[PDB]
Amino acid sequence: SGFRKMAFPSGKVEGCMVQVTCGTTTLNGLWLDDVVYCPRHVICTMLNPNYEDLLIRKSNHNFLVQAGNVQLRVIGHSMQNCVLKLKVDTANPKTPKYKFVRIQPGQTFSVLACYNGSPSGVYQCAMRPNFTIKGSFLNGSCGSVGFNIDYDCVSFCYMHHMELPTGVHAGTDLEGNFYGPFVDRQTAQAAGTDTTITVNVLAWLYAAVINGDRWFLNRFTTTLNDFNLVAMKYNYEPLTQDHVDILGPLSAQTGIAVLDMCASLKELLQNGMNGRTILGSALLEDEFTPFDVVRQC
Amino acid sequence: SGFRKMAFPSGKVEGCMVQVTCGTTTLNGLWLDDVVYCPRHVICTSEDMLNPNYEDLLIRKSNHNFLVQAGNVQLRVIGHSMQNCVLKLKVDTANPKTPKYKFVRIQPGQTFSVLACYNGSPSGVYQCAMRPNFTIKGSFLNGSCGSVGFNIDYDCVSFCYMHHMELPTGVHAGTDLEGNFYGPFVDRQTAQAAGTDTTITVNVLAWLYAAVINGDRWFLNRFTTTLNDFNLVAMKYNYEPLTQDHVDILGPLSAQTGIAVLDMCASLKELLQNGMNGRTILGSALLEDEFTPFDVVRQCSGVTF
Ligand SMILES: *[C@@H](O)[C@H](Cc1cccnc1)NC(=O)[C@H](CC(C)C)NC(=O)c1cc2c(OC)cccc2[nH]1
Ligand SMILES: *[C@H](O)[C@H](Cc1cccnc1)NC(=O)[C@H](CC(C)C)NC(=O)c1cc2c(OC)cccc2[nH]1
């Protein structure tokens, strides 16, 4: 029992992390097979780069790639969306089975925060509805990646690129397509209104229940359309039938019908928590997916 | 910027986790050089667990009653020792992946990372604190036994915790890697009292500094206090008394922020007496005490391994 925000073991990703330097700039790259992936702004001196015109000026020898102390030799370079892809003479012997994945808003993943090619720490976070993440990313953290692990397979879903003036974080998938509307330029850019991930809050109540926290369990039910009315009011994401289907196995575990759980949540939204806690949080937690709960419970 | 509860990178420990089986009980072991460390309660039986005589039980046991599996490989158990509450199963092969490591006994209030494992296979990593009452509030399911807690100092893995049991209340208890329990607990199936917990005052202060460093200053007040008057508020709220040693350890944080320790304490006093008024600090509606002052500086300066 017990319930913690857990990250995936980071070892398979630790073995892919390298340092990439171009000119003055150093950040992190991901080394898989004989390719090294990193943010393309590694080639910048920043307020509106022409990335094609700045890339042109660079040649293979202008890129220094270091895997621990081993200096890799760069035999090719190309730019795909917002990532640069450096061909190196040497396939990474520690490449795990991996995939590249574009996650949907609401899904979760682990971040291995790195500096100069070396790991500092690992932590779990969620792709917000507005396509940002609330991480811990200092200068030099760019190129750190987010990932999920299924048995033996590393699904890479995020690579870090920037901090917004608000202090949240934006980045790309490993094809270099930004999540959200952001661009890799040094402007004030607006995230967008955020919202809570309702299907994740419900999953976490199911987790609370499984752990003996049941005080919020009310004697009401509600309808999907009537709950949704309340969720719009409290900037919660609309709950869909797909979400109900997803919450089914937790419903049958606890014997609490999803729409019953929705009525408990409605009353929580409408009257607060009254100073109590749920799984040791005084807030409604929306960064656990239904899959996350099942994996841990 | 940003501040997260961050675990150490777990790679060096992942290569040390194995699956240990004795009779019908399987759980996790830690394989370092030619030794596999695990909870001795692995040798026990359903009917033995109210008060096992571990010495008697260990004598009836033969190396070949112990199956240490490492991935697809199976390791050759050569010897069997018992050190306090841990078993020491000597195997033929040394772990080629053995990190540089230490065994360390930590203090209440310090933090570490747990690599939660089931069947010798890593499941997830998370950062937690040894509570003042020597329990931990983790996430541990049957078969999570023998998972380990550690800290990393650039190169060297300091193992401090090995998980043994869940108390009837749902919190966790375990030992150091010499098998000595943290707290009054014993490795038997009986009710055992954790006894009163307190909040780790020095860690709450460290986390308020982390909040200031990250732009979250609303709680900063125009007051001061002394240690003694602070420690009167704190005891009322089951906060650990703050010592001069604690104030000394916060000094680097006071210096980078411009906020005297006792000033920050005055702000915490007010927070205990009046709550947060529905507001958050670093995303939390409660006061967080699982970041030590070393954790804050480490994360905020981006230390690496
Ligand atoms: C780790 O494998 C679990 C710890 C745990 C975690 C969460 C909830 N419960 C237990 N394994 C254990 O071995 C603990 C150790 C005791 C000393 C607390 N549990 C048992 O050892 C145990 C109890 C038990 C019972 O009920 C008494 C019946 C059959 C087998 C069994 N094993
Ligand atoms: C890459 O290491 C840093 C990552 C970082 C640093 C500190 C905190 N969090 C993340 N990212 C950058 O240097 C990028 C470079 C891009 C634009 C090519 N820029 C930003 O991350 C950035 C620009 C910017 C602006 O506009 C100047 C305003 C506020 C915040 C902000 N962040």
Structural key phrases:
13 strands, 3 domains, six-stranded mixed beta sheet, Thrombin, subunit H, about 300 residues, elongated, binds ligand A1AWA, homodimer, seven-stranded antiparallel beta sheet, alpha+beta, 8 helices, main proteinase (3clpro) structure, domain 3
Structural notes for this entry:
The structure is a homodimer. Chain A is an alpha+beta fold. Chain A has 3 domains: 1-14 and 97-194, Trypsin-like serine proteases (Thrombin, subunit H, Beta Barrel), CATH 2.40.10; 15-96, Thrombin, subunit H (Beta Barrel); 195-297, main proteinase (3clpro) structure, domain 3 (Orthogonal Bundle), CATH 1.10.1840. In chain A, 23% of the residues lie in helices and 28% in strands. Chain A has 8 helices and 13 strands. Chain A has helices spanning 11-14, 51-56, 198-210, 224-233, 241-246, 248-254, 258-271, 290-296, and strands at 17-22, 25-32, 35-39, 63-67, 70-72, 74-80, 83-88, 97-100, 108-115, 118-126, 145-150, 153-163, 169-172. In chain A, the strands form 2 sheets. Chain A has a 7-stranded antiparallel beta sheet, with no helix packed on it. In chain A, strands 8, 9, 10, 11, 12 and 13 form a 6-stranded mixed beta sheet that branches. In chain A, a hairpin with a 5-residue loop joins strand 12 (153-163) and strand 13 (169-172). The complex binds the ligand *[C@@H](O)[C@H](Cc1cccnc1)NC(=O)[C@H](CC(C)C)NC(=O)c1cc2c(OC)cccc2[nH]1 (2 copies). It is classed as viral protein. The entry lists the keywords SARS-CoV-2, covalent inhibitor, protease, viral protein. The assembly is dimeric. SARS-CoV-2 3CL Protease complexed with covalent inhibitor BC787.
